[PDB]
Each structure stands twice: as structure tokens, then as C-alpha cells.
């Protein structure tokens, strides 16, 4: 009866409260998705339990075993009843799980250390001094793996063979790499996360160029779940009322430190 929510520790969507050790259950977390989960649950009339995805991944299907990992996997195999996180709506995922209409719009973008002589994806593709990569088991990596677009095709050709690996396990790892590489590493990540980090000390990174694509994050449920319909209506109601915009301002800019 209590709905099991799978989510991921990704700032500012879900973060551990400073005093989480003295708190219980859902109260241990804070963030955009924590606030949204409470609202979705309230509007859909269900009790829930926030759980962090075991493998800390978003969701990809292994080409060899064909098994789904990450939050998608937890939904596919029945470990969670719903995923409320910055989970990108994609065709391959839509084929195995259901997604609500987008609660956030975004696109792949470029994050550089301030001062890096890069202004676009084309710029990155035409040079070799500056390395660049993406997150693992995510929609961004898949975007490049599948792109038939010349520029992105070139970029994938480079990234998949670059040594040492230009891929990272978590967004935080990618951000740290940019900050410590003296401008020799640029990170490809969704505009949402890029924009957030841009407003965080040490204020040494910035988003450059236009988004490479346009898509959205959706609340996901197991294929054919009974919660799907209500969850989708709730997302639309909250967006139409202005809550989603308020929540983004709250976690991105209201407490911006740059």
C-alpha cells in the first residue's frame, strides 16, 4: 500500500540533509525531487517511502545480458513502484516503463572551467587539447552513441576510444574533473545540472553554447501501473499552477551562491 519510490542522490534533486543521521525515513532527504514527491503523493493520495537506487545509476540495458540497471531496472523488475528523479524520457525506456508528461524541460549542454577556449560542441569536435566526456549509464551517453549527426558522431568516435576514460560514474565526478583539470576537461551534461552547478561555489564553471537537443524528465512507473494516470495528471496540474517553476527557482537560484 505504501508506494516505494526509487530516486537518485543527484544535487539538487535529492540530497542528504546535514543532520540526516538523526532523522527518519523520508525526512533524511531534501531537494527538488523530495519536494515534488511529497506533492505528487498528496495529489494522488498515496503514502510513500523514498529509497535511493542501489547501484546509483539512472538506467541502461546491458547489450549482452539485456538486463536493466539503475532506477529503470528497479521499476522493470518490481523493486520500486515509481521513480521520481531527473530521469530522461527516452524511446528505449518508454518501451519498458511508463513516463508522465515532462515535469522539467532540458537539453544536453557543455560545462567548462571558466576561461576554457570552447564555445560549442563543434569547437570540442574540431580540437584535441581539451578532453571531454559524459556520465555512464545515462541518456547523454546514449545520445552520442546513437547520433547520426556529423559533429556528435565525431565526438562519440573520440570519447568511446579516449584513454584514460573520459566517462564518469556520477555527475559530481564529472564536475570535479572539470574543476581540477585546468580547462583540459569539458563535461557534457544536461542543462539542468549544468545550470545548478553554475550557481554553486567556487563559481568556476559555466554553461556554454546552445543545448544539443530538447527533451524532458518524467515521473516513471512500471509498464501498465495503476498509478500512471493520476501521476501524469498531477504533473500537469502542478506545472499549470506554477509549482514546478517555483521549485526550480527554489533549488537553483533562490539559494544561488554566485
Ligand X SMILES: N[C@@H](CCC(=O)O)C(=O)O
Contacted entry of ligand X, Zn ion, none for residue 189, CB cut-off 5 to 8 Å set by kind: ligand X
Cα–Cα distance measured from residue 104 to residue 62, given in angstroms and rounded to the nearest whole number: 27
Say which residue the cell 501524469 belongs to: 232
Please report how close the Cβ of residue 83 comes to Zn ion at its closest, in angstroms. 20
Q: Per CB under 6 A, which of residues 92..151 are in contact with ligand X?
A: 135, 138-140
Angle at 93 between CA 91 and CA 94, to 5 degrees: 60
Residue 200 assigned ligand-binding role: no
Neighbours of 179 (CB within 10 A): 17
Q: Per CB under 6 A, which of residues 155..214 are in contact with ligand X?
A: 189-190
- Measured between alpha carbons, how far is residue 201 from residues 24, 31, 185, 194, 257 in Å? 29, 18, 19, 13, 6
Please report how close the Cβ of residue 164 comes to Zn ion at its closest, in angstroms. 29
Residue 6 assigned ligand-binding role: no
As given in the structure block, the three cell numbers for residue 139 are 541518456
Q: Per CB under 6 A, which of residues 42..101 are in contact with ligand X?
A: 58, 86-88
Annotated binding residues for L-glutamate, as ranges? 86, 88, 93, 139-140, 190
- Contacts with ligand X by CB under 6 A lie at 58, 86-88, 135, 138-140, 189-190
Residues that bind Zn ion (CB under 5 A): 16, 39
Amino acid at each position: 500500500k505504501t508506494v516505494v519510490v526509487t530516486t537518485i542522490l543527484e544535487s539538487p534533486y535529492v540530497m542528504m540533509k546535514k543532520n540526516h543521521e538523526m532523522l527518519e525515513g523520508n525526512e533524511r532527504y531534501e531537494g527538488y525531487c523530495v519536494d515534488l514527491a511529497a506533492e505528487i503523493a498528496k495529489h494522488c493520495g498515496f503514502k510513500y517511502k523514498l529509497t535511493i537506487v542501489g547501484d546509483g545509476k539512472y538506467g541502461a540495458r546491458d547489450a549482452d545480458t539485456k538486463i536493466w540497471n539503475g532506477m529503470v531496472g528497479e521499476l522493470v523488475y518490481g523493486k520500486a513502484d515509481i521513480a521520481i528523479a531527473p530521469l530522461t524520457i527516452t524511446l528505449v525506456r518508454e518501451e519498458v516503463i511508463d513516463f508522465s508528461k515532462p515535469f522539467m524541460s532540458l537539453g544536453i549542454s557543455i560545462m567548462i572551467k571558466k576561461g576554457t577556449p570552447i564555445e560549442s560542441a563543434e569547437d570540442l569536435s574540431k580540437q584535441t587539447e581539451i578532453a571531454y566526456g559524459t556520465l555512464d549509464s545515462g541518456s547523454t551517453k546514449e545520445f552520442f552513441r546513437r547520433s547520426k549527426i556529423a559533429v556528435f558522431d565525431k565526438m562519440w568516435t573520440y570519447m568511446r576510444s579516449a584513454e584514460p576514460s573520459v566517462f564518469v560514474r556520477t555527475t559530481a565526478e564529472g564536475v570535479a574533473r572539470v574543476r581540477k583539470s585546468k580547462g583540459k576537461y569539458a563535461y557534457l551534461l544536461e542543462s539542468t545540472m549544468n545550470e545548478y552547478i553554475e550557481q554553486r561555489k567556487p563559481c568556476d564553471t559555466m554553461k556554454v553554447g546552445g543545448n544539443l537537443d530538447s527533451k524532458g524528465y518524467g515521473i516513471a512507473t512500471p509498464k501498465g501501473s495503476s498509478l500512471g494516470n493520476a501521476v501524469n495528471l498531477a504533473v500537469l496540474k502542478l506545472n499549470e499552477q506554477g509549482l514546478l517553476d517555483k521549485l526550480k527557482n527554489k533549488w537553483w537560484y533562490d539559494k544561488g551562491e554566485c
